[PDB]
Amino acid sequence: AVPKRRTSKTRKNKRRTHFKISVPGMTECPNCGREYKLSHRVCK
Amino acid sequence: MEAKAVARTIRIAPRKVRLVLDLIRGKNAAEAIAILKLTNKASSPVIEKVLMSALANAEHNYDMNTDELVVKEAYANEGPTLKRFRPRAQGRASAINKRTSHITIVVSDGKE
Amino acid sequence: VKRTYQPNKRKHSKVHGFRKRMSTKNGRKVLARRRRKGRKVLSA
Amino acid sequence: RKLGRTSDQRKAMLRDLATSLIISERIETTEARAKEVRSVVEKLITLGKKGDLASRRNAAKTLRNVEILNEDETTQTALQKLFGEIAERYTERQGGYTRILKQGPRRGDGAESVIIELV
RNA sequence: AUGAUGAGGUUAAUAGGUUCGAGGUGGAAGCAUGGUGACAUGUGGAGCUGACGAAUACUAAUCGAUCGAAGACUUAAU
RNA sequence: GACAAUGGUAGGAGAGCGUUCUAAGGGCGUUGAAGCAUGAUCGUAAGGACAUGUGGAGCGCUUAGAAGUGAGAAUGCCGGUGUGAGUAGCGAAAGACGGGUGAGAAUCCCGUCCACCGAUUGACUAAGGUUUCCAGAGGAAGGCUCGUCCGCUCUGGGUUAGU
RNA sequence: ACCGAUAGUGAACCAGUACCGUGAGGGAAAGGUGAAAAGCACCCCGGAAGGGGAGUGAAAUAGAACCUGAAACCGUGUGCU
RNA sequence: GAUUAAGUUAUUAAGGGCGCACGGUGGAUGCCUUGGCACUAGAAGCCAAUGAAGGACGUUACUAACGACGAUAUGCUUUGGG
Ligand SMILES: [Mg+2]
Ligand SMILES: [Mg+2]
Ligand SMILES: [Mg+2]
Ligand SMILES: [Mg+2]
Ligand SMILES: [Mg+2]
Ligand SMILES: [Mg+2]
Ligand SMILES: [Mg+2]
Ligand SMILES: [Mg+2]
Ligand SMILES: [Mg+2]
Ligand SMILES: [Mg+2]
Ligand SMILES: [Mg+2]
Ligand SMILES: [Mg+2]
Ligand SMILES: [Mg+2]
Ligand SMILES: [Mg+2]
Ligand SMILES: [Mg+2]
Ligand SMILES: [Mg+2]
Ligand SMILES: [Mg+2]
Ligand SMILES: [Mg+2]
Ligand SMILES: [Mg+2]
Ligand SMILES: [Mg+2]
Ligand SMILES: [Mg+2]
Ligand SMILES: [Mg+2]
Ligand SMILES: [Mg+2]
Ligand SMILES: [Mg+2]
Ligand SMILES: [Mg+2]
Ligand SMILES: [Mg+2]
Ligand SMILES: [Mg+2]
Ligand SMILES: [Mg+2]
Ligand SMILES: [Mg+2]
Ligand SMILES: [Mg+2]
Ligand SMILES: [Mg+2]
Ligand SMILES: [Mg+2]
Ligand SMILES: [Mg+2]
Ligand SMILES: [Mg+2]
Ligand SMILES: [Mg+2]
Ligand SMILES: [Mg+2]
Ligand SMILES: [Mg+2]
Ligand SMILES: [Mg+2]
Ligand SMILES: [Mg+2]
Ligand SMILES: [Mn+2]
Ligand SMILES: [Mn+2]
Ligand SMILES: [Mn+2]
Ligand SMILES: [Mn+2]
Ligand SMILES: [Mn+2]
Ligand SMILES: [Mn+2]
Ligand SMILES: [Mn+2]
Ligand SMILES: [Mn+2]
Ligand SMILES: [Mn+2]
Ligand SMILES: [Mn+2]
Ligand SMILES: [Mn+2]
Ligand SMILES: [Mn+2]
Ligand SMILES: [Mn+2]
Ligand SMILES: [Mn+2]
Ligand SMILES: [Mn+2]
Ligand SMILES: [Mn+2]
Ligand SMILES: [Mn+2]
Ligand SMILES: [Mn+2]
Ligand SMILES: [Mn+2]
Ligand SMILES: [Mn+2]
Ligand SMILES: [Mn+2]
Ligand SMILES: [Mn+2]
Ligand SMILES: [Mn+2]
Ligand SMILES: [Mn+2]
Ligand SMILES: [Mn+2]
Ligand SMILES: [Mn+2]
Ligand SMILES: [Mn+2]
Ligand SMILES: [Mn+2]
Ligand SMILES: [Mn+2]
Ligand SMILES: [Mn+2]
Ligand SMILES: [Mn+2]
Ligand SMILES: [Mn+2]
Ligand SMILES: [Mn+2]
Ligand SMILES: [Mn+2]
């Protein structure tokens, strides 16, 4: 089984509308000026 | 005025770089710096280095207020693609694209 | 599976080297053709 | 109960990890192995708190064969470390001799990373 | 499968540990005894015990961020 | 000014458009040629100008001459670049942690433990290969990931026979 | 009234060469910065690669993968939808 | 009360489409010529045991490759040119 006709620019783009890393959960870090993942450790 | 820096011919595929870049775009410089630091994709350190350099020559070369900046724009473009191949069964070999990307970043402020 | 071509310096030299070439009129014709062509390498 | 690999490998792996955590008294690993190990290490510590020779041999059943574990000058083997300063340290404690701290993602495999220490 | 669904997230029993249990196994180790011994008996339904039941904040569910209303027009009726 | 005729495949006939070169004539051009790009311009067609941008040398017009004179199709040839798709694959197998190094470490070094082969995954050598051996550097590319490492890169150096 | 880099020799470039075959044999691709190397001192981010200034230059929106730089194809912004 | 009732309409764009703007890849197009191609006219038509054709290996201060040259080696003598 192989594609019978080629995907259009536009088809392939509608296909990828869900294909994206989303913004990480992040929070105001140790009062050390850092920035860290939610629920993950401050680091020195 | 509002400043720019480019990382030309990086060995990451543009389809991949664009993923992080889309997170970064239009964000304030601090947020974007963070998101770059905490994002788990491979492009992140690279785009980190580039937003950083763009900010640096934004300060030294235009005496810009490094706090008030925004990521005016950011994007990757197709670079030259080094072409390799892997051997396959029955002696045939198949094409492989080691793609590269021109990452570009532009910090800004009060436009006029 | 053993392939065709199991190398042998002693045997590759024969049937293919300058001497074995020149040993007959036809090798003369060969080296003629190759020198005429301009090979960096004539026989073995 | 969780899995990384084969039941025997998983056994050896957890043994190595617990024995190791008793030696160097905090370690870094995947969140998964951390969450599995905390069970085992805590159970070894309770055997140690018990003190009877039965439970010492039971401890020996799982714990890895050796350490230098010397500190100031020679001595304590893991097991002995377990029934020694370790056990005495926690005798007044309720449960939970272990905490898991989240490092966040590792580089090459993008594994979640965590530190597991013992207080 | 993933996501989705549901139980919870300190004013907390959501999982781990801890203490009891249920069920499963069948009599731990050490010792004492009887044997020339292999072994047997006692201590003692012993010891061990994933997922099943309870109790307990001892470890971890931290701080935090984002999303989300101010209600169009006409006509009839109060 | 009338009045007729003007669908069309194989095919016959006719008039023309454009490309290259030549000849003669006459012209444009660093105050910016060709080419390229855009435009809402012109002729009945093939097609022709004009303006702005780019570009930084060469070009048109007229009459005639001659042709490697016009492409969308040959599972045509070459080059590039898509689709498939972030899909398949990543080549039999046990690793875990501590300590180093480093810009960066699942992957390098050291250590401890664990594991695998053990008529062999050990040892020595014939063919064949022909510097891959060594040491100190290195990390673009090769390595199916990563790389500080390498049978990769640079620099230097290594094979000693009367029996 | 021959070619002008898929053309003209296979070969405008150290071609009968990379490469391919036991061998006879087969047999490529690859021309162009600028007038002048004046080939970007110096400062800035970065380990580097790369890049922003500052400069050379008529021009580097001529920067070495360098004249022009079409199309396929890939991206950012959006007016109408 | 915009309350009640009936009816009619809009905004949304996760993403897509057309138009445009700015880029990237790529190397067509133009311009160019170091090389070819087909002929003209004239020289020339053989070299070798006095060891050729073509090679191999060497020679430069540093030397991998081509060319030159050869243990007198990136050249020596000699006569003329310059
Ligand atoms: Mg896409
Ligand atoms: Mg492809
Ligand atoms: Mg030889
Ligand atoms: Mg797996
Ligand atoms: Mg228990
Ligand atoms: Mg405690
Ligand atoms: Mg619900
Ligand atoms: Mg309570
Ligand atoms: Mg007795
Ligand atoms: Mg004109
Ligand atoms: Mg036009
Ligand atoms: Mg357009
Ligand atoms: Mg014309
Ligand atoms: Mg004309
Ligand atoms: Mg004519
Ligand atoms: Mg075709
Ligand atoms: Mg996926
Ligand atoms: Mg699929
Ligand atoms: Mg080291
Ligand atoms: Mg080193
Ligand atoms: Mg360090
Ligand atoms: Mg063997
Ligand atoms: Mg082997
Ligand atoms: Mg290093
Ligand atoms: Mg090395
Ligand atoms: Mg080896
Ligand atoms: Mg050619
Ligand atoms: Mg053959
Ligand atoms: Mg400049
Ligand atoms: Mg430049
Ligand atoms: Mg190019
Ligand atoms: Mg384009
Ligand atoms: Mg819109
Ligand atoms: Mg869009
Ligand atoms: Mg209504
Ligand atoms: Mg969107
Ligand atoms: Mg003649
Ligand atoms: Mg003779
Ligand atoms: Mg000769
Ligand atoms: Mn998209
Ligand atoms: Mn094969
Ligand atoms: Mn087994
Ligand atoms: Mn909260
Ligand atoms: Mn109405
Ligand atoms: Mn007709
Ligand atoms: Mn008619
Ligand atoms: Mn005709
Ligand atoms: Mn022309
Ligand atoms: Mn123009
Ligand atoms: Mn003109
Ligand atoms: Mn004509
Ligand atoms: Mn033609
Ligand atoms: Mn994947
Ligand atoms: Mn699948
Ligand atoms: Mn897979
Ligand atoms: Mn493998
Ligand atoms: Mn090791
Ligand atoms: Mn074994
Ligand atoms: Mn055997
Ligand atoms: Mn071997
Ligand atoms: Mn040999
Ligand atoms: Mn080596
Ligand atoms: Mn790699
Ligand atoms: Mn001797
Ligand atoms: Mn060309
Ligand atoms: Mn060969
Ligand atoms: Mn030049
Ligand atoms: Mn620096
Ligand atoms: Mn530089
Ligand atoms: Mn200048
Ligand atoms: Mn030019
Ligand atoms: Mn160019
Ligand atoms: Mn003779």
Curated annotation (Swiss-Prot), chain A:
Keywords: Ribonucleoprotein, Ribosomal protein. The keyword Flavoprotein does not apply. The keyword Cytoplasm does not apply. One of its GO terms (cellular component) is large ribosomal subunit. GO terms for molecular function: structural constituent of ribosome. One of its GO terms (biological process) is translation. Belongs to the bacterial ribosomal protein bL32 family. This is Large ribosomal subunit protein bL32. It comes from Staphylococcus aureus (strain NCTC 8325 / PS 47). The lineage of its organism: Bacteria, Bacillati, Bacillota, Bacilli, Bacillales. The gene is rpmF.
Swiss-Prot record, chain B:
This protein binds specifically to 23S rRNA; its binding is stimulated by other ribosomal proteins, e.g. L4, L17, and L20. It is important during the early stages of 50S assembly. It makes multiple contacts with different domains of the 23S rRNA in the assembled 50S subunit and ribosome. The globular domain of the protein is located near the polypeptide exit tunnel on the outside of the subunit, while an extended beta-hairpin is found that lines the wall of the exit tunnel in the center of the 70S ribosome. NCBIfam families: rplV_bact (TIGR01044). The gene is rplV. Keywords: Ribonucleoprotein, Ribosomal protein, RNA-binding, rRNA-binding. CDD domains: Ribosomal_L22. Pfam families: Ribosomal_L22. It comes from Staphylococcus aureus (strain NCTC 8325 / PS 47). Part of the 50S ribosomal subunit. Belongs to the universal ribosomal protein uL22 family. SUPFAM superfamilies: Ribosomal protein L22 (SSF54843). The lineage of its organism: Bacteria, Bacillati, Bacillota, Bacilli, Bacillales. GO terms for cellular component: cytosolic large ribosomal subunit. InterPro entries: Ribosomal_uL22, Ribosomal_uL22_bac/chlpt-type, Ribosomal_uL22_bac/org-type, Ribosomal_uL22_CS, Ribosomal_uL22_sf. The keyword Ribonucleoprotein applies. This is Large ribosomal subunit protein uL22. GO terms for molecular function: rRNA binding; structural constituent of ribosome. GO terms for biological process: translation.
UniProtKB/Swiss-Prot annotation, chain C:
It comes from the Bacteria. Keywords: Ribonucleoprotein, Ribosomal protein. One of its GO terms (biological process) is translation. It holds the Pfam family Ribosomal_L34. Residues 1-44 are annotated as: Disordered. Gene3D superfamilies: 1.10.287.3980. Signal peptide: none annotated. One of its GO terms (molecular function) is structural constituent of ribosome. InterPro entries: Ribosomal_bL34 (IPR000271), Ribosomal_bL34_CS (IPR020939). GO terms for cellular component: ribonucleoprotein complex; ribosome. NCBIfam families: rpmH_bact (TIGR01030). Belongs to the bacterial ribosomal protein bL34 family. This is Large ribosomal subunit protein bL34. It comes from Staphylococcus aureus (strain NCTC 8325 / PS 47).
UniProtKB/Swiss-Prot annotation, chain D:
The keyword Ligase does not apply. Transmembrane segments: none annotated. It comes from Staphylococcus aureus (strain NCTC 8325 / PS 47). NCBIfam families: L17. Disulfide bonds: none annotated. Belongs to the bacterial ribosomal protein bL17 family. Keywords: Ribonucleoprotein, Ribosomal protein. GO terms for molecular function: structural constituent of ribosome. InterPro entries: Ribosomal_bL17, Ribosomal_bL17_CS, Ribosomal_bL17_sf. One of its GO terms (biological process) is translation. This is Large ribosomal subunit protein bL17. Part of the 50S ribosomal subunit. Contacts protein L32. One of its GO terms (cellular component) is cytosolic large ribosomal subunit.
